[PDB]
Design a protein around this ligand. Structure first.
Ligand SMILES: N#CC1(NC(=O)[C@@H]2Cc3ccc(c(Cl)c3)OCCCCOc3cc(C(F)(F)F)ccc3C(=O)N2)CC1
Length: 217
């Protein structure tokens, strides 16, 4: 793969968002991956709706949690592949309240046809990332809680518990690192991002990487 990839420079990544007091990381990760894959496939960047998943995805558990693979499946099998825009279906669950599913009054911003699960291999993940755009991943976020900047090199890596968005990497750094977009506002980390070392499976980053497919069979 290339020595470095940063999908934020290419217009494939929306501004950092804030899940607030709701366990909706899984929906932020899903949506950020779709926003990325849609733009990289040749469409103008559009912000898409986490609220749609929180409120409408019957496989997952709203603010009680979920899985990106389940959200991808819901979008395709229950919503015809379609994803509403953020502007037309705004995120209101930051206070932890969960309105009922509203299917009316929205605009469709993107469509997906399937999803894929990547192998547990940092080089496969880098290549897929470099070709296709930002990826949904899960991490052990124990080390995220006290992060204030820099490259994490001894991240606790015991149990997955948080969904995030993998947006790039830089191999020409000592040490090499991955670039991850979090959903804890731009007041957390490096304006909402974190860097973790690449090549050492930091935070178990390789364990559950997935992506939507745009314009597939
Ligand atoms: N933000 C947030 C919260 N955490 C999560 O959403 C994590 C976010 C999360 C955590 C771990 C992850 C993934 Cl892919 C996401 O990879 C390991 C998955 C273990 C199974 O975790 C879940 C399974 C389900 C279920 F299968 F029942 F649908 C639902 C939720 C999780 C889960 O623990 N999701 C506090 C709810």
């Amino acid at each position: 793969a290339p020595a470095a990839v940063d999908w934020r420079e290419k217009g494939a990544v929306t501004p950092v968002k804030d899940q607030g007091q709701c366990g909706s990381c899984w929906a932020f990760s899903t949506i950020g991956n779709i926003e990325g894959q849609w733009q990289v496939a040749g469409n103008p960047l559009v912000s898409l709706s986490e609220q749609m998943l929180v409120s409408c995805d019957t496989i997952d558990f709203g603010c009680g949690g979920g899985l990106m693979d389940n959200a991808f499946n819901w979008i395709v099998n229950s919503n015809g592949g379609n994803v509403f825009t953020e502007a037309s279906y705004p995120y209101v669950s930051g206070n932890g309240e969960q309105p009922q599913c509203q299917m009316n009054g929205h605009e469709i911003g993107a469509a997906i046809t399937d999803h894929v699960d990547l192998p547990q291999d940092e080089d496969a993940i880098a290549a897929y990332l470099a070709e296709n755009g930002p990826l949904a991943i899960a991490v052990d976020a124990t080390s995220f809680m006290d992060y204030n900047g820099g490259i994490l090199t001894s991240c606790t890596s015991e149990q997955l518990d948080h969904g995030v968005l993998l947006v790039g990497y830089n191999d020409a750094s000592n040490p090499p690192y991955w670039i991850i977009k979090n959903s804890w506002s731009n007041m957390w980390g490096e304006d909402g991002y974190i860097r973790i070392e690449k090549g050492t499976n930091q935070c178990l980053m390789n364990q559950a990487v997935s992506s939507a497919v745009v314009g597939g069979p």
